[PDB]
Design a protein around this nucleic acid. Structure first.
Lengths: 95, 75, 105, 98, 79, 72
DNA sequence: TGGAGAATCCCGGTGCCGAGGCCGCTCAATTGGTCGTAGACAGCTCTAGCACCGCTTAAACGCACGTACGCGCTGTCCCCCGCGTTTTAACCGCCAAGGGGATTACTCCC
DNA sequence: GGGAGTAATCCCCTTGGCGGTTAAAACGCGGGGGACAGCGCGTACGTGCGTTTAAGCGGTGCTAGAGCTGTCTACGACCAATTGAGCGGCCTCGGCACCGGGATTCTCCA
């Protein structure tokens, strides 16, 4: 059989990291995978067009941050920006 | 044009003050903003006109406006 | 060793880098971009799984069905705004009976 | 003979069909409908079963959203009954009909 | 025609999920027409992407991209 | 401050009259100023975001053009 | 206004089938180094934006007033719901033809 | 020297069918509550007139900041080696749907 890439184990890691005594069905697996792939495509395309609009050939962290600012509504956007900045900072400051 | 230019550019400067300080604007920017706003309100008033004619009336109520924005897809 | 542990996340970063490279979004791609994007996807996953677990605990269940995802996404205002134009299979509709239709006796 | 008042069974059915989640249109008539529509464009095309299920889901979503909009337009006209002018108004507000 | 398979109680249950108390008898033909139009547009876009991508069998991911073309995106069928 | 009253009663009247409205109530104005304010809040934040990411202090017309293409 | 009565919730036994670990590979992610250039930064120019002012004149504010229709009330009548009864098509379970797109080998040409 | 044309193949999935049967749509009717039509009134809205205000036009001054050139350097494309995370096969035992008896809870009407 061919190999198909899914995000199932990683969202299972996140689910066990938040609610430790909870299961999940295969259908809900499919909808959750579709959600994360769609928001991947949306943020990626918005970042791509912001890369093109300023005569620039590289996608950086700034473009993804501006894409989160444009594409996400409310305080959810501000909190996601904080999480991304924290992850990038500890990745860069790592040995 | 229907709305006067200076009150609309005063309004857009006041609403852009709340998001970044000391912001400057191009003149063609506020002209495009005025044109887009007028097109939006004309299309809205046509939709509320159909809403008012639906309920056997010729006077428009605000409930026509909430009906138009609810059916249209906004909030 | 692996860069997901180096960034301090659970989502993959190299897979995100490969998928950004394949999709031809730009000619060059940076280093912090997949880290930031994986953090964003993990945090959106955190709200939706939180609210779905809250819904499942309300409905006395231990496994998340898509009905609980539908209830969780259609109750929070920001998640309903972000996912307004989507639909969830085997989801159902929120309970909403308009007030004027009730038996006012 | 006991008989409920007119209007109660509508409340009961609205509650029972908003609480549940199982699909409403039966499978084989919608299969026949999608094959008959696809006969008009190109010939000898074949469908996966998941494609037919996805079309059922999309049709359900579009029609329940349309009926909710129709109900709001009917309440605005100071009635309870839905009528075809309400449906035509609901599609004209969205812009689906020019 | 198979548009008559969408029967009167099926549209009644579609109304009840949307919360409709009283239904007129002239709803049903208009409902059949608007579902005919919607499905015609969707299968047109799906056969367009399948004929461009060159298979004899139309798969679910193609109609997911067809629905995403209309801004009516669907989750949970491989999309 | 309180410059939403610059969208005056006859300007709203002409905006309705182009749309074909014949008779207008007195409570229409206090709702259409709210709708215009909501639409401008949803546009100017995207214009500000585009102007900030390009490291500029001036909102050009093109930023408004992509801001309107955001909403469609 | 209280009894009839039917619809809904609720807990115990049943079972069934599917989520989740476990094992084992394998191949794309990781290390390391190399090179070529994209953009970071400096700095120069000089367009376009903000502001102060005056003047003329169209536009709006304010109020009076006549009257057009919004809405509350009543009669009518009709068509749509509730439910009993009758026919019919979706489904189910399995089988069989059989086409179809990826999977090997055999072989060819720039 | 490697991509590609052609073909055989083991299947995997698609479509069509046939009988049972059984839920489920189809139909009919009683009858009743809402849609619809009409009238009264009184209240709010268009129209018009006099005045007052501010928008727009011109004219200018200052200067911020967009726009572009020069140069380089740290950073990302790019390639060989390698290796462990993450894919798939598979086993199971528990989560949850189902069924049934009974308590609970609205509702109708006399």
């Amino acid at each position: 059989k061919t190999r198909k890439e899914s995000y199932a184990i990683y969202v299972y890691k996140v689910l066990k990291q938040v609610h430790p005594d909870t299961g999940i069905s295969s259908k809900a697996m499919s909808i959750m995978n579709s959600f994360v792939n769609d928001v991947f495509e949306r943020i990626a395309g918005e970042a791509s067009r912001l890369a093109h609009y300023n005569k620039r050939s590289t996608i950086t962290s700034r473009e993804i941050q501006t894409a989160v600012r444009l594409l996400l509504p409310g305080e959810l956007a501000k909190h996601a920006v904080s999480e991304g900045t924290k992850a990038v900072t500890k990745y860069t400051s790592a040995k | 044009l229907l709305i006067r230019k200076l009150p609309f550019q005063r309004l857009v400067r006041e609403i852009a003050q709340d998001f970044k300080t000391d912001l400057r604007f191009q003149s063609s920017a506020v002209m495009a903003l005025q044109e887009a706003s007028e097109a939006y309100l004309v299309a809205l008033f046509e939709d509320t006109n159909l809403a008012a004619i639906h309920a056997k009336r010729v006077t428009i109520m605000p409930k026509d406006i909430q009906l138009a924005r609810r059916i249209r897809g906004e909030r | 060793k692996t860069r997901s542990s180096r960034a301090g996340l659970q989502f993959p970063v190299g897979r995100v880098h490969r998928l950004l490279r394949k999709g031809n979004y730009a000619e060059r791609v940076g280093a912090g971009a997949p880290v930031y994007l994986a953090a964003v996807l993990e945090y959106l996953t955190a709200e939706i799984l939180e609210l779905a677990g809250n819904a499942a605990r309300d409905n006395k269940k231990t496994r998340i069905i898509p009905r609980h995802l539908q209830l969780a996404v259609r109750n929070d205002e920001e998640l309903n705004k972000l996912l307004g134009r989507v639909t969830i299979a085997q989801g159902g509709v929120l309970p909403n009976i308009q007030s004027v239709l009730l038996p006012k006796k | 003979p006991h008989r409920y008042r007119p209007g109660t069974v509508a409340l009961r059915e609205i509650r029972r069909y908003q609480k549940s989640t199982e699909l409403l249109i039966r499978k084989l008539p919608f299969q026949r409908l999608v094959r008959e529509i696809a006969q008009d464009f190109k010939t000898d095309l074949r469908f996966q079963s998941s494609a037919v299920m996805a079309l059922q889901e999309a049709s359900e979503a579009y029609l329940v959203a349309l009926f909710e909009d129709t109900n709001l337009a009917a309440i605005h006209a100071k009635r309870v009954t839905i009528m075809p002018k309400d449906i035509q108004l609901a599609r004209r507000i969205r812009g689906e009909r020019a | 025609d198979n548009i008559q398979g969408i029967t009167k109680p099926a549209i009644r249950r579609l109304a009840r999920r949307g919360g409709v108390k009283r239904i007129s008898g002239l709803i049903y033909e208009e409902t059949r027409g608007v579902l005919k139009v919607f499905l015609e547009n969707v299968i047109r876009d799906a056969v367009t992407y399948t004929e461009h991508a060159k298979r004899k069998t139309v798969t679910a991911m193609d109609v997911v991209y067809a629905l995403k073309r209309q801004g009516r995106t669907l989750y949970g069928f491989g999309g």
